[PDB]
Amino acid sequence: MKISVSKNDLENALRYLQAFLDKKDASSIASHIHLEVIKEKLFLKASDSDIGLKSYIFTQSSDKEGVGTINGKKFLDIISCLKDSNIILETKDDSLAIKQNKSSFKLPMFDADEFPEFPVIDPKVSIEVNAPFLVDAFKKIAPVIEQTSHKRELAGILMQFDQKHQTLSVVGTDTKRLSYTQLEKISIHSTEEDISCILPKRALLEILKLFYENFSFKSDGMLAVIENEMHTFFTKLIDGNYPDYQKILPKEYISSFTLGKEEFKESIKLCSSLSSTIKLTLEKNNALFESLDSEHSETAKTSVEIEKGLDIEKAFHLGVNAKFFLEALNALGTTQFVLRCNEPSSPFLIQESLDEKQSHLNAKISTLMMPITL
Amino acid sequence: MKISVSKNDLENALRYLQAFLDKKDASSIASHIHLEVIKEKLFLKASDSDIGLKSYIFTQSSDKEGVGTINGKKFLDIISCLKDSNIILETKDDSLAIKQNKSSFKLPMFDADEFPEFPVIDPKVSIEVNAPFLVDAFKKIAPVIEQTSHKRELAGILMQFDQKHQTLSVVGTDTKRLSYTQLEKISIHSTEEDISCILPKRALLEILKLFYENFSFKSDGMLAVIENEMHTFFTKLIDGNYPDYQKILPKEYISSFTLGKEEFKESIKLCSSLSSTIKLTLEKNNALFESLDSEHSETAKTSVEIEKGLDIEKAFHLGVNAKFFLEALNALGTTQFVLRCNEPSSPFLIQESLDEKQSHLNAKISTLMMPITL
Ligand SMILES: C[C@H](C(=O)O)c1ccc2c(c1)[nH]c1ccc(Cl)cc12
Ligand SMILES: C[C@H](C(=O)O)c1ccc2c(c1)[nH]c1ccc(Cl)cc12
């Protein structure tokens, strides 16, 4: 191989690749990036049985095509220390030479055949994502999912496609809260009417770094492959039977309250200075907040006026987990929210104000949460 | 006690105080700040046998004078969550009440008599620091000092006062490098012609957060007390016999080279991507840099043109520790530096370009460093 490339193009590609390297043992090919120069592109890949990324940059010049490997961390550390002007990469046996005016480096290459082949699938489902709504869903639902969950299928996000009705339902839960959205009018191409994919949390986080809009999502029910102009990503899927989220959602709610999002955030954060759980009291024209699990001589209280009166007689009391309630608020796009309740001992819902209205470049995420007793 | 205070004044004071609290065991008075309201001031202190801080803020109103205590971390966490408008602090038995419009808190106070008395000294030496030169010295020399040094007197910075000659010499070493400056024309008030104070590294770091200029420094040879308008700080001194730094500095240097500071930083950083130590080669019109301790198939090289020729025949070679050499450069205020050498196996000096010229609001820090053999 012998090429010249743009310093900034190469730095960028390498930063994205760092997440897919096992960097600690530099002696192992798991710390290296595979390189391949073909027809005016440098392809760079790092991969695994269960997750991987392939990218390319255009070569400024390309003189010798072929393949090789290089330690990814060291490569990125060298290139980040050079000026913003072309870099020459050239093999010299089982070594890669890096050159930029007076600065020169040599790093060892490993056998390129030891690199795992980058997998390709025959898709059973596919979509073109032309707007940010899916990543928006991903980002808003991610905090409810535990990556190190000892329960296998909850350690990822559900994507549930309905070809019939052109919907993609997206769901996360950790058993204490469950956040979901149903995306409308998605042109789904599928060999099945209804198909489901559970994506590991770790892949979800990597997707949020790589993709925003204008990408394809394709799955064979075993791997998902996500692709845009410069990147191909893949992940193993989690093995299956995601819980029936539809069965767990309440059918109706005794009470529905429209409440101020930012005033509830500030009030909850304030009380959480001394407690992880809060007693919320709703009256007609007031919301009161009190630390609940505080140490017994430590107390935080606040309140907020509700100008447009709630439909309450006396007072409804609800124990909440502060962090979870805030995360539910953080996932909302509106200035107000709706809190839907049944008994104080049963799960309650948090959603956007006017949640039926249809929005094209944002998802609308609802959260069901289990209350704290008392 | 019952006062009202400014939210921002109180937040600031509390942040500075966090460093002097043992925060993990909330049940111990070592996690609390002592409070005392006298004559339109709230005094806040946190202290130890060996280090401490006392601050004050003005009260907006003061109704009941007295004393109390409060958990410092919790207090700061509450106040950081309130609006930028007055806060009422009021005792209610062995509890402190905090109130701001609709928001109210209670925290437990401990017995104020269990708080250690804040020490006062009869000074043997004293100065008024009216400019940033001393903190500038502190900041530039601090990186060479190991706080967890198993050698007692090297775990701090030397301050060596000469009443006769109105100088304050300031020195740090970790045995591999030694950085020093001698500050001129300091009005020293002392009962001795020559006196020395070794300040612990930990106190040095706290001083850099609290003080800049317009402060007094006073010592009895056992504690140092540093004071400005709003703060009194103290520290135990380290017990003594700081090494004779003057004896360890070479008398003359065979070679002195004026070299480019920023070009040497970039070159060293670049080579340090693969190695902690570097081979520097100086020729007449070039400086060459090569990684030295790199893994044997990994190599970094660069060079820089020296336009105004050095006074060299063939080439001088010097092994350096990259991190130390950079820290020595970082401590300099000029665009160029002077590198003074004897044999490549002996210590070499790094100083500012034109180091004799006298500068009033910056210190000039020189660094002696032991080379790496080969
Ligand atoms: C079936 C699955 C499981 O038990 O792991 C499951 C997962 C999440 C929930 C649940 C049951 N039952 C629930 C009730 C309320 C909420 Cl917020 C979440 C859940
Ligand atoms: C006396 C003291 C010690 O041995 O601990 C000491 C401390 C620092 C140095 C030294 C001797 N001899 C040296 C030679 C060079 C340098 Cl940079 C520092 C030192």
Residue numbers in the entry:
A (entry chain A), B (entry chain A): 2 to 375
What does the paper say about this structure?
Biological active form of β-clamp is dimer and each monomeric unit consists of three domains, where the protein-binding site resides in between domain II and III.
All of the five molecules showed competitive binding with ligase and three of them were co-crystallized and determined the complex structure with Hpβ-clamp to show that they bind to the ligase binding site/protein-protein interaction site. In case of (S)-carprofen, Thr154 of Ecβ-clamp makes H-bond with the ligand along with other hydrophobic contacts however in H. pylori the contact between β-clamp and ligand is favored by only hydrophobic interactions. Hpβ-clamp residue Thr173 form hydrogen bond with every docked inhibitor, while residue Lys247 hydrogen bonded the docked inhibitors (S)-carprofen.
